[PDB]
């Protein structure tokens, strides 16, 4: 259930529902400010594709689902399955 | 025993005493077994028991530790005896099991005597005749491995173990054992004089460490010569003194503070020395440019001025040698640039 | 591409893998760890606009809890200088000049923020016109001004407040004559509703203060200059004064309903600050003053319930002493009490909507922003039950 | 391709923040978040810093209730290797490695945190030299060291503590000869106070450990290896020994005053673990011991009050068993008991702040921490009342 | 210190290989072999530079101090503050 | 006011009444001249209060 997933994700600290990013860089789900999240997800997609190339340079049989981009303000969890890229903003605390 | 300690109200009435006499043999046998276990634990000798090393960590000298351990075991055995006497009633020894238990306890207590070790330790102390009287500190001859010559290492005429003996007295005096008055006087004198001796030995060890550190880097002894001279003069003044006197405390305090100041100035000079040396080495390979050379020279001169304001000793000759070396390096760099 | 095929692709049933992926990543990301009293808090005193000109009203912005509206009324130093001035003070950063300044031709006597418009200031003046201040505009002149007709107020307006929900607002204003008037916030050319507060037939009310209970917009309490508090119904068949109170023998100089929620209701409770140093913890349903705190030789000027503490309330003094009264702690001596320097007759106290920070006016224009102790400010869960028990005491 | 710049940047040690953050973050990275009554809780044995090594002291950081400091004497395994070993062990995430290490050229006897600052660690060594260490800076050498003088401590120091609050602090230390000395955390090179504790006829007291009434400064209490307990006022109207106690027959090893504070005043109760299994409880106003602890013999080292439960404490025996002893439920049988496997010489016991778990040192260096049953961890008003009436028993 | 640092960073999980990198990529140290360490670490350096740009996009004041990617066959570590770029080759579990 | 208002119903006792305000009449003098200090405010303030 999509709504069940939304309720489960919003339970996490500092998380506003569930936002899912497509391969185009446009989030299929809308939870935060549209322009900022669209540009941020576009840069996210560029980096995650270039990191996919990174890993397949030496690991041509691996798949990416986990990455911890944390700063002193907030952490972004990025997770691709094959096309849907979950991005979650979570406080480091 | 806890069960009975709950109830003692009509023990005067010989109605409940029948029950306590019914299980009296079980009581006696189990108490005997407990005493057997305690004696088995005692049979593990004090040095063989971890209690000895724990007491050693506990600032308890081994002889006193063993003595007190045996005394505590005897105390617990006597507690068992009086506790049996109280719980069972008067005259449990009249029973064959009771008299057997009492004679087992008496034999164990006789095996658990303690004054013999005290006498042996006192006799050993008298035989060895410990003392501290003599020179303030001793200078001796040792051929330290690594050098063919005979190193005249400086020591302190004070055995660190002597205070331990005092502690033994400081423990045995209240234990009830009377020690000979000579031992009392020696231990008291050593105890009261210990702080001066330990201060002297730590000061001399620190001085030796810092002076060997200085001579490790020969480039700095020329500057530190003044402090070394004053420390040597203080040592020369001190050595002539006999071990016990009244000028001991002021001389000890001034030597300690002088050594501390010497060491701190040594470390400051050392750190600024490697700073200057590293800057000189950088100047050696520094690229040909008036600005960079001028900046290096400015920093070096600032460091030299910082040394000057601290009012160290023998600055001008050190400055002259440093200038000679820097001008040699400048000449080499000028040759490279000119060619 | 566009936002229509995304809906169908969401409705597609290939999301088992995505759901398992999301469940796994969330359940693995669940674990989180770390990587490694009364005080003078702040000041505010203009000099161009705050030479004498005593404080007259204070408020905080609900939308912007860092913003305070001042109101400096009296103009006697220079007739040529501006008559009424309203200064706004920000909390986020410390400055020596007010953020924004507003000038009105008459003397401003009361002021408050607008709830619907978070960029608008509305205040009452001495002439009796309700005065707007469109903060977007760059001009100090009032943007919209109510007419001084018989339809609107013609007496010194001292209480103004906008109430309602974001989609249904009403700016209530009461003047000393007693004519209550609701305007629309966007249109004030005409009074959209108004009626004259009258007690028993042919008896006008000398209104000098009011307060609406939290939540209610239909009934409220009013404090009259004649020392007799009343309760009025704003809208209904029985619109007007509905209660007569014996009150106190002195003019009411302040009033406030209860300002807390979360436990057993206390909206029936409110405090009046009279003109003889007699504040009155006291409820609507009863008619007799529940308690009559009395001290001092001088007298109070304002009293404000704590927005978070169901017992604490402040207390102005004309001797310069600000004292906070915590009923649960005690009922006779001020729980906290300190006197501001220069012993000037303070005129107002307003609590920050956070309830953690208090404000005090002044008789010379120097608003002082005081801070309170953490223990004395925040209540506990047992605090409400203790307040209930203390009220049940008598 | 660089060959020396990397080599020289590796040689040049600017790795302070580097190493600090790497250590604080890699043990965090130990977490396995891969997408594809008594009970032991955490047993720690540092293979590198606790191989055949005896725990010397234990302390829990009040400021950071996850940091423990432990000590060690000289190592008989190797004298050439560093002798005074100090360890800082953390409760953030599970790891075998200690969070911090520290060396002292002399054998370390006792160590503790500083109440004045939440990062400095202060410890008394076997040479009677108070040693200061800065946890935030990554260094092995002592930061500061008190002078070894006749005025200062010269005999081995076994107890150091910080009294007062964070702006009225004072570092009090005791020497086994009997010197009490007061220092400050800012400067550790000159005793602010120093006085040789004396009972009568100018004979000193071989103090082993000391404690203080919680919530109070001054009026200290000490225990002697002679087999005595004393109350001695720090400054008062007369410093020195003020009260003899009948005490225990054998040497006094561990002394502690009551800690838990509630509706009743029990800060005058003293527990003393002597060398004869006899953990004696009494009060400062009575010269005789109140109750006695007797189940076995032979050296229970130390006893500590649980800061949360008023009638419950802990004591650990040298033969290898720690027993939690409650006064409310029992008086002759332990309310809880456990033995560390291998039956080792368990040395030191320490209640963590707010209780709920205990820390135990060992002669083998394997410190074990573990919680306590909830049904016996939490106290209640009934506990205080029944505890008081059990004092009324005798 | 150098050797103790690498020893404690390796034996903490029996890590296959870690080298200390205090320079911007191109490290000459080796833990199994020169190529798989040096080229992969330089590649990691480039991608963490691009990650720093990515995190500065949302706000320039933010910096990346912690980065891990835990995939199906590899877990890769780097903790950059100014020039300290970690590398960890480890099993996914 | 409070400190003897703590008594209120106490001094109806035969001995408490003799225990109150016989020893404290001088403090009633003190509160009288406290009232004098009170009227001091009234003395000269009329148009400039």
Swiss-Prot record, chains A, E:
One of its GO terms (biological process) is visual behavior. The keyword Nucleotide-binding does not apply. One of its GO terms (molecular function) is identical protein binding. High expression in heart, liver, brain and pancreas; moderate in placenta, skeletal muscle and kidney; low in lung, prostate, testis, small intestine and colon. Isoform 1 expression is up-regulated in 64% hepatocellular carcinoma (HCC) patients. Pfam families: Robl_LC7. Gene3D superfamilies: Dynein light chain 2a, cytoplasmic. InterPro entries: DYNLRB1/2, Roadblock/LAMTOR2_dom. GO terms for cellular component: centrosome; ciliary tip; cilium; cytoplasm; cytoplasmic dynein complex; dynein complex; membrane; microtubule. It is found in: Cytoplasm, Cytoskeleton. Keywords: Acetylation, Cytoplasm, Cytoskeleton, Dynein, Microtubule, Motor protein, Transport. The keyword Transport applies. Belongs to the GAMAD family. Homodimer. The cytoplasmic dynein 1 complex consists of two catalytic heavy chains (HCs) and a number of non-catalytic subunits presented by intermediate chains (ICs), light intermediate chains (LICs) and light chains (LCs); the composition seems to vary in respect to the IC, LIC and LC composition. The heavy chain homodimer serves as a scaffold for the probable homodimeric assembly of the respective non-catalytic subunits. The ICs and LICs bind directly to the HC dimer and the LCs assemble on the IC dimer. Interacts with DYNLRB2. Interacts with DYNC1I1 and DYNC1I2. Acts as one of several non-catalytic accessory components of the cytoplasmic dynein 1 complex that are thought to be involved in linking dynein to cargos and to adapter proteins that regulate dynein function. Cytoplasmic dynein 1 acts as a motor for the intracellular retrograde motility of vesicles and organelles along microtubules. This is Dynein light chain roadblock-type 1. It comes from Homo sapiens.
Curated annotation (Swiss-Prot), chains C, D:
Changing residue 289 to A: In NEDMIBA; likely benign; can rescue neurodevelopmental defects in zebrafish morphants. GO terms for molecular function: dynein heavy chain binding; dynein light chain binding; microtubule motor activity. WD repeats lie at residues 50-99, 103-143, 152-193, 202-242, 247-292, 295-335, 341-380. The keyword Hydrolase does not apply. Keywords: Acetylation, Cytoplasm, Cytoskeleton, Disease variant, Dynein, Host-virus interaction, Intellectual disability, Microtubule, Motor protein, Phosphoprotein, Repeat, Transport, WD repeat. One of its GO terms (cellular component) is vesicle. The keyword Lipid metabolism does not apply. Pyrophosphorylation by 5-diphosphoinositol pentakisphosphate (5-IP7) promotes interaction with DCTN1. Serine pyrophosphorylation is achieved by Mg(2+)-dependent, but enzyme independent transfer of a beta-phosphate from a inositol pyrophosphate to a pre-phosphorylated serine residue. Its main location: cytoplasm. One of its GO terms (biological process) is microtubule-based movement. It is found in: Cytoplasm, Cytoskeleton; Cytoplasm. Belongs to the dynein intermediate chain family. Homodimer. The cytoplasmic dynein 1 complex consists of two catalytic heavy chains (HCs) and a number of non-catalytic subunits presented by intermediate chains (ICs), light intermediate chains (LICs) and light chains (LCs); the composition seems to vary in respect to the IC, LIC and LC composition. The heavy chain homodimer serves as a scaffold for the probable homodimeric assembly of the respective non-catalytic subunits. The ICs and LICs bind directly to the HC dimer and the LCs assemble on the IC dimer. Interacts with DYNLT3. Interacts with DYNLT1. (Microbial infection) Interacts with human adenovirus 5 hexon protein; this interaction probably allows virus intracellular transport. This is Cytoplasmic dynein 1 intermediate chain 2. It comes from Homo sapiens (Human). The chain holds residues 208 to 621 of 638 of the full protein.
From Swiss-Prot, chain F:
It comes from the Eukaryota. It is found in: Cytoplasm, Cytoskeleton. Cytoplasmic dynein 1 acts as a motor for the intracellular retrograde motility of vesicles and organelles along microtubules. Dynein has ATPase activity; the force-producing power stroke is thought to occur on release of ADP. Plays a role in mitotic spindle assembly and metaphase plate congression. Belongs to the dynein heavy chain family. Dynein heavy chains probably consist of an N-terminal stem (which binds cargo and interacts with other dynein components), and the head or motor domain. The motor contains six tandemly-linked AAA domains in the head, which form a ring. A stalk-like structure (formed by two of the coiled coil domains) protrudes between AAA 4 and AAA 5 and terminates in a microtubule-binding site. A seventh domain may also contribute to this ring; it is not clear whether the N-terminus or the C-terminus forms this extra domain. Homodimer. The cytoplasmic dynein 1 complex consists of two catalytic heavy chains (HCs) and a number of non-catalytic subunits presented by intermediate chains (ICs), light intermediate chains (LICs) and light chains (LCs); the composition seems to vary in respect to the IC, LIC and LC composition. The heavy chain homodimer serves as a scaffold for the probable homodimeric assembly of the respective non-catalytic subunits. The ICs and LICs bind directly to the HC dimer and dynein LCs assemble on the IC dimer. Interacts with DYNC1LI1; DYNC1LI1 and DYNC1LI2 bind mutually exclusive to DYNC1H1. This is Cytoplasmic dynein 1 heavy chain 1.
